[PDB]
Structures are given as C-alpha cells and as structure tokens.
Amino acid sequence: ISSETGEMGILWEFDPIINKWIRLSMKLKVERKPFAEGALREAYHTVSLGVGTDENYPLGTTKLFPPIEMISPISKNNEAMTQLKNGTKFVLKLYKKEQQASRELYFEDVKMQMVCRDWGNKFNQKKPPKKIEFLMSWVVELIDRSPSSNGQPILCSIEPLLVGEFKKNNSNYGAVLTNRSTPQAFSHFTYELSNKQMIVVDIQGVDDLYTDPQIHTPDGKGFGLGNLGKAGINKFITTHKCNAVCALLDLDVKL
Numbered sequence: 001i002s003s004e005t006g007e008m009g010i011l012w013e014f015d016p017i018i019n020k021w022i023r024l025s026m027k028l029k030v031e032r033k034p035f036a037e038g039a040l041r042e043a044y045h046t047v048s049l050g051v052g053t054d055e056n057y058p059l060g061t062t063k064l065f066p067p068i069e070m071i072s073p074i075s076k077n078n079e080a081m082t083q084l085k086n087g088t089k090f091v092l093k094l095y096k097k098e099q100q101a102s103r104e105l106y107f108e109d110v111k112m113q114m115v116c117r118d119w120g121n122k123f124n125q126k127k128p129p130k131k132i133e134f135l136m137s138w139v140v141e142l143i144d145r146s147p148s149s150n151g152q153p154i155l156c157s158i159e160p161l162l163v164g165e166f167k168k169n170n171s172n173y174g175a176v177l178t179n180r181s182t183p184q185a186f187s188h189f190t191y192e193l194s195n196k197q198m199i200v201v202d203i204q205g206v207d208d209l210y211t212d213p214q215i216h217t218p219d220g221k222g223f224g225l226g227n228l229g230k231a232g233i234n235k236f237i238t239t240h241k242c243n244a245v246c247a248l249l250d251l252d253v254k255l
C-alpha cells in the first residue's frame with residue numbers, strides 16, 4: 001500500500017461463511033532472527049507496510065491451488081485490511097528444515113484455524129464464564145524471496161502477535177498440560193456438539209486468545225498431518241475429566 005522498504009507478499013484469507021479464499025497483496029518487514037520456536041516452525045516479529053489488491057500479480061492458469069472455483073472474484077472486504085494495516089506488529093512463521101510441507105498444507109492449516117475460530121464463536125454463544133477466541137491466520141507467498149533448489153516458491157503463515165505468557169493447555173494426543181477448565185471444556189464441547197464428527201485440541205495461546213489448534217476427525221482426512229483420526233480422539237477421551245465448565249454447558253459425562 002505505502003512504501004517504504006520491505007518485501008512483497010501474496011496474502012490469502014479464508015472466509016468460511018462464503019466458503020472462499022480472498023487473494024490480496026501486502027508489504028511486510030520481517031526481523032532476521034526468530035523470537036521463538038517449536039517442534040516444527042520458527043516465529044518472527046514482523047511489521048506490516050500495508051495491504052492492497054492482487055491485481056499486479058496475475059493468477060495464471062495452467063490447475064492451481066486453491067482451485068479457481070474456491071477463490072472469490074471480489075476481495076474488497078476482508079479482516080486483513082484492519083488487522084494488518086500499516087504499522088501492525090504481527091508474527092510470521094516458517095517451517096524449519098521442510099519436505100513434509102506442501103503448498104496444499106499451508107492452506108489446509110489456515111482453513112483449519114478458521115474452522116476453529118467459528119467453533120470459538122459457537123462456544124461463546126452459550127455464554128460461558130470465559131469466552132474464547134481464535135486468532136485469524138493467513139497464508140503468505142513471500143514472492144520477493146528466491147525459490148530454493150527445488151523450484152518451489154517460499155510460503156509461510158502469518159497471524160496477530162499475542163502479548164503475554166504463552167501456554168499450551170492440551171496437545172493433539174491426549175496431554176492435559178494445565179489445570180484450566182475452559183480449554184478442556186471447549187475441546188469436549190466441539191466433540192459433543194459436532195455429533196462426534198470432529199474435535200478441536202492443541203488449545204494454546206495467551207489467556208483465552210488461542211492459536212495453532214489441531215482438529216481430529218474419525219476418517220483422518222484433511223486438517224493437515226496432525227489429524228490423528230480415531231487415535232487422536234480416543235486419546236482425548238482417555239485423559240478428559242469433566243469440570244464445572246463442562247457441566248455448565250450440559251455436556252454428557254459419557255463421551
């Protein structure tokens with residue numbers, strides 16, 4: 001939008017309510033060194049230098065992912081234009097040294113986060129002691145960065161900066177890592193209210209602002225490599241103890 005030295009990116013937002021991706025551009029400036037890492041990715045402080053349209057960067061085609069029918073022809077409205085306005089401090093995440101990553105996985109992961117965000121709203125609507133919220137997430141094609149040896153463009157995901165102490169409350173394979181009730185009751189709520197079609201675990205973040213969740217489904221399909229299917233779900237069942245939040249939401253002690 002307004003520049004000023006940084007790098008260009010193709011910015012992708014998923015909107016669940018119209019079931020389409022919204023394609024934009026942005027400029028960002030990222031720090032050279034990461035400020036945190038996990039098992040898979042490193043996270044980098046970044047500043048936004050504005051969000052604009054994708055008009056200078058034609059799509060193609062010939063195929064494409066996401067496919068053309070999954071892309072909105074109109075991109076005038078989106079969260080990115082407010083949440084990533086010029087001057088915003090945010091987080092960029094890059095995979096560490098990865099051959100398990102594919103273009104399709106970046107998009108699966110961001111869609112997954114958007115799905116959990118809808119679940120957070122549905123939870124909040126039953127009026128629990130502590131409302132919860134999932135951060136937006138976005139796919140960025142770092143188009144100014146040179147493709148590595150394989151010829152693949154550089155991709156990353158971005159999300160807002162969380163301020164405070166970052167805590168993980170459950171894992172994607174049955175760990176209950178804090179004594180807080182809301183995160184565990186939310187996981188249980190997603191399982192029951194979805195009629196056992198899915199569960200949201202890996203509940204982590206700062207307070208009840210959450211990021212990087214994981215979904216399991218009975219058939220194991222979609223939701224990235226962390227979808228552990230029936231094993232994942234059952235592992236949650238084994239360690240769940242219902243709490244006051246579960247009871248308040250009228251969730252069945254039988255899972």
Ligand SMILES: Nc1ncnc2c1ncn2[C@@H]1O[C@H](COP(=O)(O)OP(=O)(O)CP(=O)(O)O)[C@@H](O)[C@H]1O
Nearest residue numbers: 036037038039040041043091159160161162166212
């Ligand atoms: N939006 C955000 N704001 C501030 N810090 C964040 C953040 N998202 C992640 N972090 C921090 O960066 C670390 C690594 O990021 P992330 O957790 O996404 O890596 P990962 O994909 O390897 C999963 P894990 O760390 O659980 O193995 C987190 O453990 C947390 O400390």
Ligand SMILES: [Zn+2]
Nearest residue numbers: 188242243246
């Ligand atoms: Zn419960």
